Amino acid sequence: KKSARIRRATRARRKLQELGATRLVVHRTPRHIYAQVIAPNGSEVLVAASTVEKAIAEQLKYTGNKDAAAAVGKAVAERALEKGIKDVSFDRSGFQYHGRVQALADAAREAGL
Amino acid sequence: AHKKAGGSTRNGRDSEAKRLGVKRFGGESVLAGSIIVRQRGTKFHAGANVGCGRDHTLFAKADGKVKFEVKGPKNRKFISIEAE
Amino acid sequence: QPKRTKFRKMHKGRNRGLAQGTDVSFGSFGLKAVGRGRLTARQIEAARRAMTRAVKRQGKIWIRVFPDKPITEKPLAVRMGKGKGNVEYWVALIQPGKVLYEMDGVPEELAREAFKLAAAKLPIKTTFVTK
RNA sequence: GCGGAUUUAGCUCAGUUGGGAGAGCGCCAGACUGAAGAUCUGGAGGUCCUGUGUUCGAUCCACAGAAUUCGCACCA
RNA sequence: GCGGAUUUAGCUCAGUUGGGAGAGCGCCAGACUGAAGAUCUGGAGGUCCUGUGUUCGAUCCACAGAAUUCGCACCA
RNA sequence: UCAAACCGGGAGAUAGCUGGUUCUCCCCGAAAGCUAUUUAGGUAGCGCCUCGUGAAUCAUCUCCGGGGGUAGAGCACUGUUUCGGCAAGGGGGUCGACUUCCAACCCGAUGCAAACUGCGAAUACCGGAGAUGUUAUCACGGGAGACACACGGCGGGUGUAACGUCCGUCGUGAAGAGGGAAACAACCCAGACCGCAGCUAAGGUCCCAAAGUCAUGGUUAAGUGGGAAACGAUGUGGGAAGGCCCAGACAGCCAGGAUGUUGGCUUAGAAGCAGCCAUCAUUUAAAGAAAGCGUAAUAGCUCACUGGUCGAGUCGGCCUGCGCGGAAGAUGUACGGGGCUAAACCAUGCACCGAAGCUGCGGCAGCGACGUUAUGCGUUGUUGGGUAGGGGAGCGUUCUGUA
RNA sequence: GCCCCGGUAAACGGCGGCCGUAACUAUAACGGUCCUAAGGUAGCGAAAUUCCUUGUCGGGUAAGUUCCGACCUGCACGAAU
RNA sequence: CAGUGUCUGGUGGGUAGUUUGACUGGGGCGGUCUCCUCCUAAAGAGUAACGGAGGAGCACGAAGGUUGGCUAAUCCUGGCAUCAGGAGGUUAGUGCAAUGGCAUAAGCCAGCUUGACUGCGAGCGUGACGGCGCGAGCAGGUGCGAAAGCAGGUCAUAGUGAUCCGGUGGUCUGAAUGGAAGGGCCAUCGUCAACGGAAAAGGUACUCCGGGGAUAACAGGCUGAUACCGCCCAAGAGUUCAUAUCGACGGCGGUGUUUGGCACCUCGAUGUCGGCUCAUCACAUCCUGGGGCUGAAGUAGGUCCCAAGGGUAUGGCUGUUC
RNA sequence: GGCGGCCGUAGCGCGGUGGUCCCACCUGACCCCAUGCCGAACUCAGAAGUGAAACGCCGUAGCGCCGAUGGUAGUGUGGGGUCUCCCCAUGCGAGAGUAGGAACUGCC
């Protein structure tokens, strides 16, 4: 078969769909950072939390740094464990290393994922 | 060096390909069929090729690619006996 | 005879050519021939040149089918040399109901006498059609 | 008809790392000689069989055609 | 495969004193001849197979590799 | 006796070379590929005959789940190739506009292909389930023949060609009766126990000849009854379509068919009528400066057109059925004969003769099933052609046992 | 003994092609140019040894691929093959 | 010197054998016998011929792997080398004869790096059959990557070959012991490219025998391209005038006397050409006779049909047939 | 614009219109970080100016693709004649033609 438009952009991952589990997409914005736990077959979002929502707790500083990306990971993951999910793979479509995505992943494990 | 004299292919021998893998009985995770080498994707029964369709069935065993862009090269999604 | 062309070797030239008549207006007349047959370029010239040499009154005479199927021959012994292109040049394939020569003309037929002269040159019983 | 060889500047011929067209002789001229000769030097002289195809570019590849030559075949 | 010889300036070759690279021919020039020839004189032309090692320094030692040639071996 | 002695001797030399190879009956009944072999008209493991053992459930004639892409078709690689329109380039003539020619591109109509395609079979074919079948399929092992099919027709491929090599379809020689087709390997129909009865098939059914000179309808007339062709034909029959038709036409018969002009040009000459261009005008009911014949050139004779008379079917054209022209040669000529208007032939149909066919009465074999120790009987399904070859029974025979 | 060089062809042998001059035309004759060194002058030569060749000219005959004489580039004739 | 005995190397027709394969439009000459990849093979499979087209017998540490960036041909514009912009699934390129695959790519550029690891099984090649190859696991471990994952060389299908012997890597092995020389299991490398594979060439008219049509040179038969003849259309020549002789181009046929010639018939053999001599059975003819066309005015001729009724009776060179 | 469902008729082109809620452009590069030569890439920051390239809606069906109603040629298959060849029975029907879909649907 040919390479779908998505495969050409290599943003997706078929190797994580062969397992039949969930993902941990990490959206990044020059103002905010977002994370989700979408499941196969469309865009089924079970749990998610934005850095802007972190303010609801008691956030003061900017929401576009590293320490903020780690705070969101603990929130999205905490809510995930409350849902019923245990395992999850990391899905960072295009990005560098040691960036905010790594801090997001390291935060997810800190919760229990 | 370069090629010349336009034409189709270039004549060979007798086709060496079969169709092993009943995929309705016991099936160890291995190449189900034989025609063209190199190809992956299908981990179970995924017989799906342009036309009236394709199919296979029953056999609990992780992974099980096909031959290549031939008898249903597409990769479906899981399948086993009925209660392994 | 499996239809043929070239993509092989260059043979003789066209004994035909002169389409004749003016093509500023496309008509829908003709001279159908009941029966399939292969006509060589030469015989096509004799028939075409026959009517054209008679329709001096006017023109608008045209032909749709042309020879595009070569045919080789072989003179002498045999054992080395598929076939060469000799007298047997291109040949046209005519269908049981195909229109060959059509002249753009309203009921004033002065070429029926011309088509008749040509109808006696091609190996096939042709018939005159008004439509 | 078949196969092999050959088909480069007037003549006789070299030239496959595909990317320089060259040698001997001849012709013209210079030089020299009283001068002519002969050397010697210089120049001119080549659709490098033909067309097409292939390559960034082929005399030097592939295909087709033509000519020459040889062997063979044919010849009440 | 094994062994011997050979592998110096275009060509044919000398050169083991390890410390000069040279000769003949050829090429160019000079002298000469009216001139050309041939002598004769002069000049140019050498990664002296390649690398490494040995020595102060080696074409001329040792080792390794390559070329050429011959004998031999193989050539189901 | 010598391009090499005779005799005997170690030869009943070695051969992938030829020939040879003899009694009866019963059952079944071929093939011409692969790997290897000092092997290729030889075996072994295997495609095929037969027998014993072993295992086990399909197989395929079907259906169902896959793989291929040929024929054909479409329109397609490539290399040719038809026309028109549009845009760009080059060359020539006159104006920087246009006209003409050539090559490449696109579109529509046209289309092209031994090496293609927007589409697309039949069909063969891998794996798994069924009606059918239940023990077939399939797994093992032993003993073989074996890897030199060909020919005719049709369609081919290679082939410049020989009583081919090599594929495809069909059909036979193979393993086929009987039978007609006049005779006949294959065309049509249909398949062999015995004796016998009936009814059908092949074919035939007027006579020899056994069976209706049978039924309905039609054609041909040619005796065609069978070679026959590219080509011609008011021989004849049938059908559709245009125009002219009874307020005197379309065709016959009678008479006109003219004047400038022997139109110009050209031509030895052409004065309607070689050819080259025009083709107007005149008198007027009609008469083309003339459609043909004719002359060396004129002349002459018709037609077109009009009048009278004639008073009726006529004229141009398309298609279909059958026969025909294209056809001269061999000691006596005809369908098997007689001969038949059907005792032919064509389109159908019916009854019979006619096979060892089919059915019925008295007498079989092989295989499988049931019961059985039984391959002995009884019953049941299939019942019975055969070369090469396989298997089995049998009797003629000699001598020596025991009765 | 042989490689080495040389002698020896009464050693096995090799002797193709081209231009010019010159002729009414073709050839022979002479020199060169090239290839492989020479390329053939005595005689005699298509002769039982030349294909092409019934070669060319001619005798002879009504005519003779026969024969004889000459020329002769000598396909694959030529020296005690 | 010798004579001579024995042995080794070289030279050595002076002497003896077709042993040196096959296919093949008889044979010979010319072309082909290993292997890969269209068409032919007629939609699986498999499938031939001196069947039409074209190649492999090696090359390479990189044309290996991974990652980042990038994306091509070709055409147009401004300046064929370059650079900037636009169009552009891609026709580029990807080692190799072709098909198939691929572009935010297996393509290009750059950097980095190097899994061409060891051991052992299951599966794949209708129908049993080895070496070899490939797809897919497991156990222990090398490289790169974050990791999954990717490798058993270069995208896949040609680039290869036994036994004996020799040269190379651990062990085992011969009255009794030491020192040596010798004898195997697995694997790699070296040659056979007339390439499943011999160490190396040739005539044969004195012929014989055992066989076979599975072997040609003739006659017959098929075909008829060639050959002979006719027909259709008809340019043109003919002072003018196609059609009154001649008659091109092209098309359509007949005969089979000619020739080339597809091997079922005969080579377990109908000995060869022509002539000669002798017997038997027929017709596509020159004159004469009767006719058709006429470049037939007349005359004289040209061509064609018919006709055997009569007559075809002779020499020189050559064996020769025309 | 947010938030869902259905979930390849959402391939690919093309038109109108709206929200300063939202969003790319744009703007600025002090720093984290980064380009072999180029903060273009990469990464960070602020928001002057638009909608010229998203998104929300909504209008054409070109072309790709997926379905539906109608039918000639072609073709599967078994008997008939006939010089070749053609015909009949029966299952379908080239390819052309007429139409369907450019989203659909809930909530703030």
Side-chain angles (χ1 to χ4, degrees), chain C residues 73-125:
Chain C
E73 182 58 297
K74 310 85 60 58
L76 198 60
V78 96
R79 210 207 65 174
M80 181 181 271
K82 196 291 180 59
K84 306 292 78 179
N86 301 60
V87 298
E88 299 181 301
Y89 194 58
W90 295 187
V91 69
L93 295 64
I94 304 176
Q95 299 181 60
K98 177 61 181 300
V99 54
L100 295 64
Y101 302 112
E102 67 86 57
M103 189 291 271
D104 303 300
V106 68
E108 299 178 300
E109 265 55 297
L110 60 303
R112 188 181 67 176
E113 297 295 300
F115 296 124
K116 180 181 62 180
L117 300 177
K121 294 183 177 299
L122 71 176
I124 193 288
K125 297 183 178 181

Side-chain angles (χ1 to χ4, degrees), chain A residues 30-31 41-42 44 62 95-96 100:
Chain A
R31 302 187 304 177
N41 299 300
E44 301 300 300
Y62 193 58
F95 193 64
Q96 60 180 60
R100 289 65 180 179

Side-chain angles (χ1 to χ4, degrees), chain A residues 14, chain B residues 40-44 46 63-66 72-76:
Chain A
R14 178 182 175 298
Chain B
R40 301 108 302 84
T42 61
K43 10 82 285 299
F44 299 106
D63 190 297
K65 1 64 60 290
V66 70
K74 301 178 181 59
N75 315 304
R76 291 301 178 182

Side-chain angles (χ1 to χ4, degrees), chain A residues 9-25:
Chain A
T10 185
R11 60 159 53 184
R13 64 303 82 194
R14 178 182 175 298
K15 181 165 294 183
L16 289 62
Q17 298 181 60
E18 61 179 300
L19 180 60
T22 180
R23 295 183 296 158
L24 183 59
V25 187

Side-chain angles (χ1 to χ4, degrees), chain A residues 24-82:
Chain A
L24 183 59
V25 187
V26 182
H27 293 176
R28 68 198 68 62
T29 301
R31 302 187 304 177
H32 302 300
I33 188 287
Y34 203 59
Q36 300 178 300
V37 184
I38 178 276
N41 299 300
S43 300
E44 301 300 300
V45 181
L46 293 63
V47 298
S50 180
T51 181
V52 61
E53 299 181 60
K54 186 64 179 181
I56 300 178
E58 188 176 59
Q59 187 63 60
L60 189 168
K61 296 184 178 181
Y62 193 58
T63 61
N65 50 59
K66 185 179 182 300
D67 53 294
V72 181
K74 300 180 180 60
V76 182
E78 192 296 300
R79 301 179 181 180
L81 180 60
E82 185 63 60

